[PDB]
Amino acid sequence: RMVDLPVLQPRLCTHARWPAPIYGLLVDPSLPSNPQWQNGRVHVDGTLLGTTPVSGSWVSCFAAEAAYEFQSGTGEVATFTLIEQDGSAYVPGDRAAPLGYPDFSGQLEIEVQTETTKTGDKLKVTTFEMILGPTTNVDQAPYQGRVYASLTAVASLDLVDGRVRAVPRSIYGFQDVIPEYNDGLLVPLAPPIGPFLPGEVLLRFRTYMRQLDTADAAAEAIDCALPQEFISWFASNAFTVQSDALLLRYRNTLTGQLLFECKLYSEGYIALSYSGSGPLTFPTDGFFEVVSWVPRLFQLASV
């Protein structure tokens, strides 16, 4: 069956690298042209790349067996022995980390369900600080299945060790650079997004992350190559891939007017022909439609 796409508008879709709605659609040649994002990566034939999960609820989260301890001078320290978020054992293999593990850098505030032995309480939700990267002095190694988090406290919180699911609360010092997956060593990674033709630029689906910032109030943008609905759409359909890219049309939902034509490369990224120097945003209430297969050298009309 020939590849098709859902009629979903981007503004009603889920971001693939941070669990939030998609708010923006744009091209920006001033940003890095070939990002090596590890989440939100799928081939059109349905092969997931990097750490990309099928469910958007796995994005920028992790699951682990948690071991807690109090360290004087630092506070409550958590050692997370990672597991895949469905409960299957994490085995180091041909990807950077467990599925859905964050693929960006900064200090991430995470939330976990904790059980305490203190009388009068039983189940709580505790916020931990976890440094992702680019470099840390904590020796994070999610590739090996071990990450560390901490929280300032004057005494032990008396937490009970056990299974946890960690969800992201905020990001501090965000950088769109892959984190420390293996204590400074490199890991199997999905390759950089690309290549592009002359004049082609990556189409970006943008959301904004909850952040901690002591001076700047501007929202923190993060981009992904495809909405999560498109990621699971390809994973479910398992289309056969014919050419190197698909010619798509982005049209206004109500009128049908064509907003731009673009190429969905089979490697999982959308390209537009745009020669401008600054960002160019597009309406988020349109829809994509598959036109046909095209070769790599197919020249798009400029937008």
Binding site: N182, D183, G184, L185
Partner: protein, 111 residues
């Protein structure tokens, strides 16, 4: 605040022994400690290495024991020969660049 320190120069005698103490900071307690030989520094030949425990390890004439209370691992070289002379290193195994301290070993005959 150096990660690992030792003697800059030690001298032994043929058929004798020498001992080398490599002191390290507390943070490196649970790391493997080793004694390696030759130059270039970071392509040296590891003679003996611990398993990050306090168990004594011996390979041929070289021994190693990590004291994880005083943060000193002690290297012992027995039954020395003149050919044992050269550049050695106290080492702590890590990802990437290892903490290493240069130890020059001279060997001479007994008067």
């Amino acid at each position: 605040e150096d990660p690992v320190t030792g003697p800059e120069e030690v001298s032994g005698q043929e058929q004798g022994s020498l001992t080398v103490q490599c002191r390290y900071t507390s943070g490196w307690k649970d790391y493997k400690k080793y004694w390696c030989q030759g130059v270039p520094q970071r392509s040296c030949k590891t003679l003996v290495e611990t398993d990050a425990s306090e168990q004594l390890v011996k390979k041929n004439r070289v021994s190693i024991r990590d004291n994880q209370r005083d943060f000193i691992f002690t290297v012992t070289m027995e039954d020395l020969r003149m050919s044992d002379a050269g550049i050695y290193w106290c080492g702590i195994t890590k990802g990437g660049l290892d903490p290493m301290f240069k130890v020059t070993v001279n060997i001479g005959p007994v008067p």
